[PDB]
Every structure is written in structure tokens, then in C-alpha cells.
Amino acid sequence: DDLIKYTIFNSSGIQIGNHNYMDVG
Amino acid sequence: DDLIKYTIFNSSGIQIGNHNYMDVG
Amino acid sequence: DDLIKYTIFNSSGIQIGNHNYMDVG
Amino acid sequence: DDLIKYTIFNSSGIQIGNHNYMDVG
Amino acid sequence: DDLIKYTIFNSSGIQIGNHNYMDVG
């Protein structure tokens, strides 16, 4: 029941962890 | 019962884990 | 039950971890 | 039970870690 | 139990770590 919930709007990707990166341009 | 729910809109994918990266452009 | 919950609106992604970076522009 | 909860509205991303940076503009 | 919880509204994020910086303009 809503154990994991990710809600995003008009946002960049979410990087959770190590050695994670994202370039936005 | 909505155990896991992902909502995205105008956004890149969500990277959950290690050694995960994505280039946006 | 709401073990992990990430809700963001009109914001950049949240980078949690080491050696994680994001360029926004 | 609400082990990790991040809720933000109209804000910049929050970078938690070492060697993490983000430019907003 | 609410080990990690951050909530901000209409404000810049807070960078916690070493060699972390954020330019907002």
C-alpha cells in the first residue's frame, strides 16, 4: 500500500545511488 | 493495491540503482 | 507503508549519493 | 514507515553527498 | 521512522557535504 511512490512533474530525472550522474542541456 | 506507483510528466526516466547514468540533450 | 516517498513539483531531481552531479541550464 | 520522505515544492534540487554540485539558472 | 525527512517550500535547497556548491540566479 504505497510502499514506494515517486511523483514528479516538470522535473529532471532523479538519480539515487552512487556513481550516478545526469547532464541536462 | 498501488504497492508501487510511478508518476512522471515532462521528465526523464528515474534511475534507481548504482552505476546508472543518462545523458539528456 | 510509505516506506519511500518522493514528491516534487517544478523542481530539479534530487541527487542523493556520492560523486553525483547534475548540470541544469 | 516514512523512513525516507522528501517533499519539496517550487525549489531547487537538494544535493546530499560529497563532490555534488548543481547550477540553477 | 522519519530517519530522513526534509521539507521546504518556495526556497532554495540546502547542500550538505564537502565541495558542494549551488548557484541560483
Q: How far apart are the first and last CA of chain C?
A: 36
Q: Residue E10, by phi and psi: left (phi above 0), alpha (psi -120 to 50) or beta?
A: left
Q: Is the C-alpha dihedral spanning C22, E22, C18, A7 positive or negative?
A: negative
Which of D16, D18, D19, D23 is best to mutate for the E interface (most E CBs within 10 A)? D16
Chains that touch D (3 or more CB pairs under 8 A): C, E
What DSSP assignment string belongs to D1-25? --SEEEEEES-----BSSS-EEEE-
- C14 touches E16 (CB < 8 A): no
List the determination method: NMR
